[PDB]
Design a protein around this ligand. Structure first.
Ligand SMILES: [Cl-]
Ligand SMILES: [Cl-]
Ligand SMILES: [Cl-]
Ligand SMILES: [Cl-]
Ligand SMILES: [Cl-]
Lengths: 171, 171, 171, 171, 171
């Protein structure tokens, strides 16, 4: 506690809250993944998509905790609330719930970035820019693409046909 | 007949009955497989699924017979009844018939396990646990997954679209 | 300007106009490609098809410009008009717009060929025959095939089924 | 919900409680690991030991959840309580806390085994025997070995010398 | 002097001062390294640690000078003051002196970042974020870890034993 330099108690606390948010998100994705593995749901690609995201969110939490120690802050852990639902409905319902979750993580990142800028903490700002902000933009874009394709597929025969052309002829 | 130790006549007889059940199941799966190979049915992946299961059930019977001789019991064979149907309907009908068949094998395994536990025959109990009980749980889970996906595919355009998203986008 | 031989001012000017047409076509295909990359359109195979065509049309322009210098003519560049639409509708709408665009390039090639024949410029005529006329015929044929398949897929269950048979059974 | 066979509501609920215990244990080990990564603690081998155990406990939870779905039970997730301490003291303190935690997991496994035996659920009993009970016995033995060696090292010069002989001469 | 764009005389001068600070730091580390190579000190791993840091600080100076020329500023060199001590005491004394030196470099980087932000010079800000700020945070963390371990080792038999357990058993 001989290393801390330019690291505010406000950022230290906000990092611990962000770690809680990322571990909550990881927990939500674990629940999503095992719901799609139910024998009465049985979409094993959807289960894999969500289990991979649970791993990504735990890795984001671990990166934050590594950074907290690099800066000389102190990790503090809080209770992890259970996910918002016990059953996640259709693939469409689940993808909508996932984009809501990612937008909430993204807003927490943007709020922490703004705190770090106000505190003139450029290490914190660049840490977020380099490891989190573009990862979130890329994931939200992918989820938006998925939402549009699920809506196309479930909505009409014109939509299913247009999806199949892209899948079987172009790629 | 110099090797038998802790092997009850009750377990010996029950093993011979189980071999009959597994060979009957193998016969049922042979009939299922060649029904899907009919030029007027022509689902060669369904034919392959059922022919592979016929091989698995014959292998289970052979493992039981190997174990009967390892314990010093005497294999006794009975007539093999023909399968319950000559025509198996749709893929859905066939998968429902297959899960009924597997649940009946699983209950026969559980009943033999309970007999072996009552007879304090731990070799028999562990034999079943190690080679049969988890194989049955894994297969029944796969069949339940298949049933749900066939029901999704044949039922509606929302269901077919949700299946295709998992197939063409996620995997 | 010691190399020019049998190269008319009429062909020189027509080549510069053709370069403008090919760069306009490239620009149109860039706009088509990024429209299909929108999160609310999200057909990434369609996006790739059109971005590849933008590259092909820029390469055709560059070949023309290389030839202009090989003959001792002088490249002159004009303003590039923006594409005709800002949004391109469905895959069907887009493919119809692409075949209209290709037919217009093809007619400009045929008109330049006829000018070169009238001017007795066989180098120009063979240049077009060797690098452009069959490329256009092959691309227009592919686009016509795509149009028919998109129409089949979006139109009816008989059409979608016939497409799927070709895709999943024959190839 | 067409697969469930011989799977009691008592075992189903107990499995969900066990998943909670394993995820709580994983969380405890995450906190232990990052405490040893503090610049004022700085035992990076101890940090690695505990982070590896956090991964093992999450994998145990995931195996339980996979099994819950294989049997046709329904995963239900509860709030994850935060670890018991925010600071973990010395390596000795931490290893003592880890063996207490493992003994509590082991007793929960033994209690679930006894429930499964009472319910005549041999699949559950063998699942625990095959994937959990010997993993726990091996880990508790390793932790007991570590406790004894830490006590030897911190206690006396005779103990440190005896440790060093084993380390530098025998291995 | 045809390239300079958005590069203030304030930043240009501050970069030249920073180059002086980094070359002074390199000189300090050369002196530290050869002190530990004295036959009456003889800690050749400590000598190597400090000689590697002398190379890192010279490389940081060279990167700054490359950037000064990339922006169209003019390198100006000043006298390099000799290091603060001729003898560096124990490994503990030396590591404390090294963390003081690194914190002073880090504060000079943060001050230059703040100047660049005030001058709206994002190239300068990102240059520092990308090549210097995280290098300093990682090095200061490592030095803090080293300080804690040296203090543990020299302070007590409990501390030495805890160090040895991590070294000989865990890693
Ligand atoms: Cl609490
Ligand atoms: Cl008979
Ligand atoms: Cl103009
Ligand atoms: Cl709750
Ligand atoms: Cl001077």
């Amino acid at each position: 506690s001989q290393i801390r330099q330019n690291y505010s108690t406000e950022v230290e606390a906000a990092v611990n809250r962000l770690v809680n948010l990322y571990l909550r998100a990881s927990y939500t994705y674990l629940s999503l993944g095992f719901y799609f593995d139910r024998d009465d749901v049985a979409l094993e690609g959807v289960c894999h998509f969500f289990r991979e995201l649970a791993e990504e969110k735990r890795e984001g939490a671990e990166r934050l905790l590594k950074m907290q120690n690099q800066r000389g802050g102190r990790a503090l852990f809080q209770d992890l609330q259970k996910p918002s639902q016990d059953e996640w409905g259709t693939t469409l319902d689940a993808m909508k719930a996932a984009i809501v979750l990612e937008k909430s993580l993204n807003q927490a990142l943007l709020d922490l970035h703004a705190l770090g800028s106000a505190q003139a903490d450029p290490h914190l700002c660049d840490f977020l820019e380099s490891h989190f902000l573009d990862e979130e933009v890329k994931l939200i874009k992918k989820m938006g693409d998925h939402l549009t394709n699920i809506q196309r597929l479930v909505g009409s025969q014109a939509g299913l046909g247009e999806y199949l052309f892209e899948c079987c002829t172009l790629k």
